[model samples]
Target: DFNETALLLAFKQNSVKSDPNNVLGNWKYEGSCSWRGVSCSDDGRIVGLDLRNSGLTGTLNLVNLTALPNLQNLYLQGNYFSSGGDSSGSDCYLQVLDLSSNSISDYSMVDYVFSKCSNLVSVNISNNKLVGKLGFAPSSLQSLTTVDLSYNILSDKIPESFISDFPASLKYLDLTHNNLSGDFSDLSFGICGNLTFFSLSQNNLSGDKFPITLPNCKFLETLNISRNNLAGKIPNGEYWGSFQNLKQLSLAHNRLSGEIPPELSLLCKTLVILDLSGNTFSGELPSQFTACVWLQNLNLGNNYLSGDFLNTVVSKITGITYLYVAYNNISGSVPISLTNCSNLRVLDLSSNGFTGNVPSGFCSLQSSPVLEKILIANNYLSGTVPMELGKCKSLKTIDLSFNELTGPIPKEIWMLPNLSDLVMWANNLTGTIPEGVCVKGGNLETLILNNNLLTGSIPESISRCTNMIWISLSSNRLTGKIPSGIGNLSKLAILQLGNNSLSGNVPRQLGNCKSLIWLDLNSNNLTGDLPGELASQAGLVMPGSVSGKQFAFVRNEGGTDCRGAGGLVEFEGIRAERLERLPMVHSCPATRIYSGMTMYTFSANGSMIYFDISYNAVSGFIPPGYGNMGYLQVLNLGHNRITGTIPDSFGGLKAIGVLDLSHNNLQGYLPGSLGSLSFLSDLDVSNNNLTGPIPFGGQLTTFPVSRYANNSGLCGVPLRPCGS
Candidate 1:
């Protein structure tokens, strides 16, 4: 075992491999020493060398175990070791070294192999690509127990000897993820007294304060300090209420706040998977974990825990089997003692604030064929919608969206033979259109009944739902026509019939929807025309997050809103007075060229920031590639019948912030590259059809009078005061 021979001469110099058991590919120094998957011990004096999951390649300087001096146990795990030669060597026999799942990428070779395996107990270098710092071995890993440097790329700090290492034989400790930052009082626990599976998950550790004394983690059992950035409270005493060998506890996304400590019901007698989700923990939910009979998975979702949740969790864990109290503020009702759990499957109470009704005998789990999934959406639940949830005949998915539920939707859950997803959107639910909805037949995908009040018509037995993929009947009131076999749902994508009062026309067999993507018939009353086969369908895909798509920027706090997507934007002051107008006439392109002052469209997704469609009734005559929309932002074509003039290629929009061509008919003078709009804050070409002299200094200084009120011929540095 070439102990840390300078990490086998820094894993055989510059470690680089394409693979082929690559980790200094198998090296043999004479045999009969049991080399392959190396192992010795029985008086063979090479204690152990199980090249862990060997697929060995190169590096670790050809693992030259300096003539194996009874090496204890060194498994090289999925190999590809690097970092060879540098630390200047003097090899020793490693006690127990498992270069866990390898491809090792220089982790100071774990402090140069714990300064020469000073009786190393057990050390598994987890998943690897090991970057810098995050090294260990306090006083020679003093008879260390177990330390798995999880997933790696380990960035530093989190080592105040990780609580001043006083390892009197430490237990399992995994530094999950790793990029460890600090806070939470730089960590401490007076030296992990016989720690038990303690994982410092993810890690960046911010603060708000949290860190209770772990009285020698009394034979502690699985405690994952999830995400991390500890916040206030949730560390009640009695050593966290006597964790007589705690059973899996993850303090989710920390920022933990107060309450939620009824002495954690003395840790519900060896708690079993209790993850305080997201964590901002507030009162309630300690009504004695319904007598914690070794609870089974209970996650208090995105917390701020409220009251009434049936006096804290349906009279306490009726033997929970995966119950997540979704985004919280949990209110009451709906507690039929959750039909006494009966080995429940999974029930999530979405967005909470729960009001009454909606029990349907508390999800008799698809009539006990063993429930599948049911998430109660935005709560405030109200009556009906229960025909015993069609007695959950082994239900698959059912999310009742923003509630206030009312009747209908229980033709025995459309005769489920293994129902597939049926999320009822904002409700008041009523009748009709259920024509034995693909009954005896199953394989439904998604039929989200949108903002409902519901009524008859528009059903044609939903063309036998041929395994629909998502069909949302928007803002409902419902009426007839629509069914030309409703494009036999070839996996429909999204078809929201906006604001309803829906009429006929616009349905040419919906151009045989080829996997249609988000086509909302906005504000509806429905007429016709604008449907050249919907410009070749397929668009709405949305899924990737961290916000990039469909504009997102919320931030409210306390009253709760919080969202922080990318492209971060936030504005309040307001100035930019002009340019890039379009308050209607979104599309018609039958060619119309204008130009004396600027009229529009040079395509590139028609780049628009706030183009308003005035009051629709559009009549063209202004199209000179709509002034080559060069990232043209915010343009409002005020009213309608937009006739000629006003184009000088609308002064090639230099990021025209807000330009309103007021009550259109628009006309002349104002060109001069509209003074290369320096982010023209908010300018209006006032009730259109002319202009003169209003070209004072580029983008008219400081706009005021409601952007030049009801206008025709404009003048001056914005109305008056212009000279030479």
Candidate 2:
């Protein structure tokens, strides 16, 4: 009887081990059509089953759908469903099946799920654990219009037949974030005339001049093939017709070289977003790109594009909002015409060969309400900080670091209500920071004013800004006491005031910063013992961007001043100069070796993993409580007047990488536990008064002789061989 089939559908309901959303509580009804996730037509036959994000768990096999013959759509996305067998039961009318964001791992089983559903028009199995090639489609998938199998472990090359016999009705296809690799240049797109959106980003796909393969996709609107190994020049086939309908095109982070084809401007009228960043494209900015009438976002950064920055497309695209052309070789003075783009919100022109004073016209942005972020770091731009920038009431972030700019930071800009990140490090900026830099309503968070010619005491008024998170005034000529009020910044994460002439006793009030992650006060003229509370609290452990271990290339030790915050610097000119200083000492061994360079990179909200207070006049015993900071990665307390024995608790630093306590007044035997640091790469306890055999075993024996040099009364392997 049909009633038996209804019970079969009930069997699927009862099989759900957990229904956190309680979406299946209504499954007890006499008719399965009354179920919460079920649908029924006028005739009262189950036609659909949608349980998206319902948190249903357990094997999907036990819930057979054969009973609902009219099921046209089956959705089980965002669930904990695992371990399913054959789903080959017939359901010809099932037009849409979405099993995305699940734990489905078997690729062939997914292939079988749709084997009998010949009328299926859409299939989305993305963000799952599915592995192997994407061979899941049925042979007669003619009606399929959308297919998204992204964010999976699928591997292997795309089958030629899969593309050759692409469905005529296919309009959307996304296979991003997988291991699918192969050249797609020779693939024919003639049959995909209706395909409008295609994305294969974050894959291993490689093909030179693959753009030529899409000659037939006249209706193509959005195409993303970024983050791949695709190499060679962009296609410039004379016969290639106009891509008039194309709106968004992204080929970023590839190995593409050669000058951008002038013919690409053909679609500029409709193109809104164009990203070709992180490539090898050379030559001057394409003047032909001035045809982009409605372009809103353009990212051509991280390339070899050169020539003067004059009369470029940036001057013509007045409506553009985000323009990123950093890390190129573009030269010439700052374009005054850049202010013409009144709608611009973000303008990043850092790390280029651009020389000359920043255009005073940049202050004209005060009339533009949308202007928010202006990053012009690592250039030769000289001239006083623009006073007109203060008028831009909508300004939020400004980074003019690593330039030749001189003059005091404009006091007018200090009162901006929305300013958050004011990074002006490595410049020739003079004059004291104003006491009123942080207005009452100021939202300042990150203040990186290091490596400058700044003088005068740091203003005590800064402690009023409770939202301040990062404050770095290091490498300057400033003299002041450690502000006790700075401890009031409960959200403070990074405090870098090293290499400055700042004096006064260490501020124990700093211990109040519960969220403190990175603390660098090295090379200063401070004094007093280590703050015990600073080490006892659990330090922030934000995940670093780059790998924790790297066999990095050392730079020329004297070529660059690599010391700064340990993190990724986006500006290439600064990064190039920064990395140039820490020259490689030797070829890398099989093991991880922390170079004297190895600048760390952190995300915008990354936590502190490095703590260095070396080269200072401070005198104090190392606090044993420092061992409690389990997340501390790099600890450098060298060249200081620190006294007493090295704490045995120092050995508890399991995650410590580079431990530099050289040139210090430390004594006593080396901690045996220090040898247990498995990740330790470079250890420098040299120049200390420690008298004893160096700890042996574990990673300690791998140290080079240079690490133990100049230490008094210390004898060990690489030193005096500990006298056998």
Candidate 3:
């Protein structure tokens, strides 16, 4: 506790001199040592400093380091380090420094100031606009451990000398989610021999050669090299000698290809978590995958791994807690042995070739309190909803959508007390959402029963889901009005009741749920004017909100079926090169620059970025706003009774990728804007009374005739260019 006293005294003295006017200097020195933002070891050494979001303002000076020698941790985050803002070579032990999450902009002194702190371990300088190249001579940090330098403006290829200079004591080196480039993997293992963690995710290091060498990293434990542009096979083979103590490995979101090496299984023993999702890894699952006993969390989702789902691959994985094998080609019945994974908390196997009925003891898994989430959607699973599932008192989520499921949804399954999500969309299951399902079972979070044959009225007991975040019953045969009290759930994010038999005016009481993100009631008999109350939903305010306001776009495909679900409207149709400008333009008016927002101008080289049009029934010439919407990657004009000219302003969208004008009566010239659409692919102008000289140039010249055939007056280019 004595060390705690010295550390705080040093901090106070340093901060007081930095800002003498502030009353923080008046804080009392308490003995509890449990004071806020202070973490000390049993022997009285300050081990951690976690002042994450405190609104403290101060500067960091060199004199502060002289007060606390045992201080291995230093967190001065979310605070202004200095007014002048030059921290390139401020007076401090740069070696053992951790000045992350601060507004330290001046980074000119990164050259040799840190060379003196030889005992420095972990230095986290993240979330700061530290410009200039960041590299350290390995000799300067002989005892360095972890280094997190993320979210900065540091660009340029990381010099090879920096990695080769690091000392052997270095373990974790995270340069993730940054603008750093180049392949330094070949030099990493040669220097950091004692590395336990290595992460360089979301960088611009792309188009590198294969056979990446990490010969000296035999002691590495965790390796995260995801979201990079690195292409070709990541062959571990002879270079990656062996991993004995490796625990966690993440290599997702990359352009990697070829067969995943079987040698990776060597780390299976000590590895507890293995994440290789979101890659192009083709071929069969690693045969040795099941040999590793300690392997629990395995995520092989969104990959090109083919073949049947085998129980042998999972028979021994009893200790597995989370398993995500979605979006693969693994066909066959549900792995019967999955029941052995009693401790399973999350199981995602959607978008696969799995067929057949549910396993017998599937519901019996309620024995494991951690059995919370189960996703088996987009498969061929059949049979009735098991009544035994009611035994799963701990069940929180269940998604069995897009499958061939049959029989009535079990009433007992709906009686569960802890169910949170029940998504059974696009299935053959026939039944009503059991009465009092959410009212009696309290903790339901989502209820997506869309695209089903379910009948009967939405149970009034649905009001019980006060914490519900999503509710979808679209594309069904359900009748009657939506419960007015449905607004009771304050946390509702998505409410999709479209394509159903539900009648009566859209419930006004639904506005009570302020968090509503999506409200899709399309293709229904609910007759009413556009409700302004729905605008208050939180989902309407931000990107990806649930207001059901889809930003429509178009793709430049020569094939038919270009109309994307009926909402894409392209006024112009010109090839990118043949046209005078880019398809998408972002040139916005200077006055449009509101308080915290920036003004953007669209270039002639169309690069569509953003487009949103919610409420009202509008028609007429596509506004000049469409031309300046260079960032307009998606354009949507939903529920509008619009008509009139499809302006040529659209020719400006260089990246004007998707154009949608659904539920409108738009007509006239298909703007030359679309002719400039080089990246234009998906296009939808359905439900429109349109007529035009469909100008088709460049990529648009090859589009199928369907896009232009709907309009009675439409002729030319797409049909028979002007006067064939």
Candidate 4:
């Protein structure tokens, strides 16, 4: 019971860059058996080393691992191990090895390690930077059962020899997220009788057929070929019937087309998960789908499938937990029988042709506790939202936007404590939002009820959602002062209450939102000077640099029956062209002296890009502080009662692209500094009381004369000679 390799391990410990957990600190004080991650045998031989997330670093040279000759289970996963050197000798007893989620980049490094560990059975090197072909010397391993090399950069066609010669006992094989491509049908697995799980998703594999010899895997339980270039129909011949124990199947995000085979019901009793999303499958849903009584998750989204749901689907699936049929040509009302699926948790029928009133009892899942995420947007659904939904306390997101739903939002629906996103835009819903809507611990993050008939002021209790990020109540009949307490929301990023009847001063407290990004109070009855406090907020952001607060204004086609009417027309709002230029604009070097001068450019840690208070009764001098918002791209104060001189401070607006000050009562000389807006493409100061010559350089002179036509005394190049 003696060991002299402890010093050898101490020398190996020097390779670790840092140990935040101090796991390896004890390696210096005791026998190898006493180390934090070390395990010993009866004879005091180090048999295992499990430092999964020990904050280890530097190269994971298996050559150093030779110190512990008896190490059988080596788990160095979830660390910062960067590279590796060659192993000097073999690990005859190594059974399990997991180096996943490390910085290992070369496939050769892993192949070298595998050759050194000839007896390893389970190998998980998933989620790493490993590149090159999926080539591992198979002859070295005699009993390899599981191999998970997913989420790596492994490229090249999977060799047919590798498939045909895979170990007969191999049970699980995952090669997802690699550059592997070639005809899958060309490969063959001679007789991998025990192979149960196989995944090749997110690859470049192409072909119109399912693997020719997959049916030979009689014991296969799960097969995932999603996110590839796989085309043609899924195999649905008598050969598929051999999969008596098949449980989960995923063919999503591919080019697979043709009717979903009715023969799929052959495995209905065992199948639990099925995903056919992001494909071109068409034709009526087979009534045979009713046989999948044990199905828990079914996704057929983004397909061309058509048919009414009055029959064929939903009613028969009594054990369904997730159902997604969005972006299809399916019509008819949501079947009330769906409520009978007591285990249902997620139901998404969005972007379809469904019509008729939403089934009032859809949320009657009294037996289900995890009922969450219901999306039925972009439909023709009418009638009021069901009040029974209030009982669904587990709901997280409910999107019924772009529909014809009428009446008020059910007050009970607001009581959900976990409701994060409640979007019902472009609907006919009326009445006010319920008071005290943010239940305690409410996770409401996005509340978009715009383009509806909703009236009444925003509920003051909305401040309860301290986690709120995006709130838009625009284009509604809502009237009342901007909620001052709304500024207290520390995470409030986007605020849009425009095109409403809201009046009173712009709340100064709004400037308190440190994360404020997009603010649009335009087309309202607001009255008062622009709040200068807004420009003073710290960490102001540039739009499009980060993705959030995308307000899609869609105008519905004429007619009450959206069933036969043309689809809605979308207005990209603000800069439709300038937005596409952001990736290149924001990615520029931290600073650059444009043209001749070193003018400070727009850049911030936040995403506050667009600000528009135009078309309102907001009067008083334009806030010069707005110029400090160098991150702003669009500033629209047009169609308001704003007066006084245009702020000379506007010269600091380096990123301002669209400035609309038309139809206002402003007077005095145009700021010659306005010419500094190099990115300005749209400018409007028409119909103002300006008395002096307009700016004559940069984007100013490039604008059309109509922009200054209505000005009483304005004279410039776009109008007429200033000294003529």
Local accuracy of candidate 1 as per-residue lDDT tens digits, 1-724 = 3443332333334343343554344433333344344455676555665655545556664235533566777676776665532253555566677777766777655766666667778888888777776655546667878879898878757765454554678878888887777775656666456777888888777766555555456777998889877877776656576567888988888888877777777877888888889877877776666667878888888878877755446545666778887777767775777766766777887777778887677454433556777787767788887787666677787777767788777677778777776777657788865776765635676677766778766767776776775566766788755667767766654455544666655555654655443344544444433333432331222211111111112212211011111111111111111001111112321122212211223222323322333333344455554455455565555455566776677676666776766666666666777777788876766666675666656656577755665556566654565453
lDDT tens digits, residues 387-442, model 4? Answer: 88877778888888777899988777787778888888778899998777775435
RMSD of each: 24.2, 5.0, 11.6, 7.5
Q: Which is better, 1 or 4, measured by lDDT? A: 4
Q: Where does model 4 exceed 4 Å of error?
A: 1-46, 64-68, 86-93, 113-116, 308-310, 363-370, 388-394, 414-420, 439-444, 459-461, 464-467, 540-607, 668-678, 689-698, 705-724
Error of 4 at 241 (Å): 1.5
Off by over 4 Å in 2: 1-30, 61-63, 83-87, 109-115, 134-143, 211-213, 238-240, 308-312, 363-367, 539-574, 581-609, 620-622, 633-651, 654-724
Model 2 lDDT per residue over 1-724, tens place: 2563465455556447787777776666455676777788878777788889888886766226644667788888889877553455545577888888888787756676546666879888888888888663455777888888899988888876565476688899889998988886755564567788889899888877674557677788998999999999877755235564889999899999999888777778789999999999998666878888889999999999887543566788878889898888888887888888888888888888777886656646345567798888778788888887877677898888787889887777788789988888768899988888676436678788866889988777777877787787877898988888888877776787877887887788887775677788876788777788776455443433223322123222321134433332223225444433221323321122234332334333333467877767768788888876665788888777888888899777877887888887888898898888888977888787887888886677788877777766788775676675
Q: List lDDT for all candidates, in order.
A: 0.61, 0.74, 0.62, 0.75
Residues forming the 10-long window of minimal summed lDDT in candidate 3: 570-579
Instruction: Locate the minimum summed-lDDT window of 10 residues in model 4.
Output: 563-572
Per-residue lDDT of 1-724 in model 3, one digit per residue for the tens?
Answer: 2554754666666553444344344335656246555556777555555555556655555334434444455666666564212333323433456577776555543343355455677777777767766665546566777777787777877776666577777777777777877764534445446878777777777664542445456777887777877777766666444665778888788777877788777777788988888888877767787777798788888888876434777657778888888887778888778877877778888777777886657646355556787888667788876776667777787778666788788777787788876877667778788776775674687677766789999887788787776677766788887888787877665576756777665666775765543455655555443333543332222232222321222333222222112222111111122111212222311111112112222212222234344233333444554465444565655546556656666776666566666556676556665777888876666556766665657465566666445565766655665564
List TM-score per model, in order. Answer: 0.31, 0.85, 0.67, 0.84
Clashes of 4: 4
TM-score, ranked from best to worst: 2, 4, 3, 1
Pairing residues by index, what is the TM-score of model 3?
0.67
Question: Which is superior by lDDT, 3 or 4?
Answer: 4
TM-score of 4: 0.84
